[PDB]
Amino acid sequence: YFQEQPLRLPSPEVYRFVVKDSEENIVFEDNIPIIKGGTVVKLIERLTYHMYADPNFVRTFLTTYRSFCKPQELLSLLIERFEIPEPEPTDADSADLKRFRKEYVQPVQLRILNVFRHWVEHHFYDFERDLELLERLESFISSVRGKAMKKWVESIAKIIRRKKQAITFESPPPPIEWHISKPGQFETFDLMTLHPIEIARQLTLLESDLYRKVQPSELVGSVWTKEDKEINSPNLLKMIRHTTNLTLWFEKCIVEAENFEERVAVLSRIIEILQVFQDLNNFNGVLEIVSAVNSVSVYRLDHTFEALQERKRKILDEAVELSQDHFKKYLVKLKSINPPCVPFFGIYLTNILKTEEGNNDFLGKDLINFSKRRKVAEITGEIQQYQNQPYCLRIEPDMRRFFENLNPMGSASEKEFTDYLFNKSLEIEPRNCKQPPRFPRKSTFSLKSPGIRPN
Ligand SMILES: NCCNc1ccc(C(F)(F)F)cc1[N+](=O)[O-]
């Protein structure tokens, strides 16, 4: 309701962050204002604005900035923003200078240190991937002089020390289940020799830990599909590669069982493991098995599926329904169950890949489209903010290592391995055969399942 005297600022030629706002360097949305886009200089200016604090923009920026700015560039810009020159003395030469220091220099310099604090607290992986970046930040933070900023400086270093350093159960976990293979002899571990309960438990723990380690920045900008995927998305790729190898493992176990009765038992055991996956709300494991039975080499084995117990076939059909109609039943099932759970990552990745292709990276000079990043950060934010629980199950390390190091493809490549599985599928059940041919049983152990009831 009143316009006060404007602050006397340095020239834009000496401090490029005070260049005047224009639709050619920054754009806002008509919905604290909401930034639609701009130059990275204008984005940094609003990231450390002097008039107000903007924690939502800080959180969103530090999650998404790798899609439009490198971590080294971000640090340089923040340091450049910190080193604010004072305006050249008036043509007559202190009232404007005292005002400039209290209302502009101190607020901006404190906003930058808050950005540093959020950066090292919530995204220290940047400094683990780039040690030169961390030594630049420590060198700059040491050179920071001022008693008002000492609390901030020692707070940043306190967090860095914590990050440079780096189970227990609420209720007693149930005992580990063993079938034919016994503790220690990892060389004999296999789908049918291990216990179906414990296969599902150990893969559920493994897939829960893999899922928990994925951070939003590994998804922003689809960086897991681009040139630097191994560096920017190491946890997400481990999640994708585990799911690929486990899906191929279930397919291999079925098709390589040439004896018909052995193959029906193998498929039956897999449906039992699926049964425990559903008990544990492990939807990743459920859809791993559905993907395997939907492979062309397994799906065509009509004699195998028709020999199943009707109860086990209805369990499998129930799980196949989860994915039908664009995962309609899966979405309402996930919303209804309670944690601990392991949601399916695939639907999230397609959501993000679809908005990445729809929205443009840029909005005179081409300006970074930050609204696109805010939309992508809102998808990942819904994943991060789900209140999930750790599983109350004990880890068996040898089984864990067995599932970690599963390599079903052997020496063959992707297309060669699918050719091998489809040719083997045609051998064990030929096209238009009246009954499956008889093959010798390769297992020297019984295929009777111990069930999925514990104790
Ligand atoms: N930190 C655990 C929660 N976060 C999380 C988990 C999984 C995924 C994905 F994509 F793999 F499905 C993505 C995220 N995310 O981006 O938040």
Swiss-Prot record:
GO terms for biological process: B cell homeostasis; insulin receptor signaling pathway; Ras protein signal transduction; regulation of pro-B cell differentiation; regulation of T cell differentiation in thymus; regulation of T cell proliferation. Residues 32-164 form the N-terminal Ras-GEF domain. Residues 195-431 form the Ras-GEF domain. GO terms for cellular component: cytosol; plasma membrane. The keyword Mitochondrion does not apply. Keywords: Disease variant, Guanine-nucleotide releasing factor, Methylation. One of its GO terms (molecular function) is guanyl-nucleotide exchange factor activity. It is linked to Noonan syndrome 9: A form of Noonan syndrome, a disease characterized by short stature, facial dysmorphic features such as hypertelorism, a downward eyeslant and low-set posteriorly rotated ears, and a high incidence of congenital heart defects and hypertrophic cardiomyopathy. Other features can include a short neck with webbing or redundancy of skin, deafness, motor delay, variable intellectual deficits, multiple skeletal defects, cryptorchidism, and bleeding diathesis. Promotes the exchange of Ras-bound GDP by GTP. This is Son of sevenless homolog 2. The chain holds residues 562 to 1041 of 1332 of the full protein.
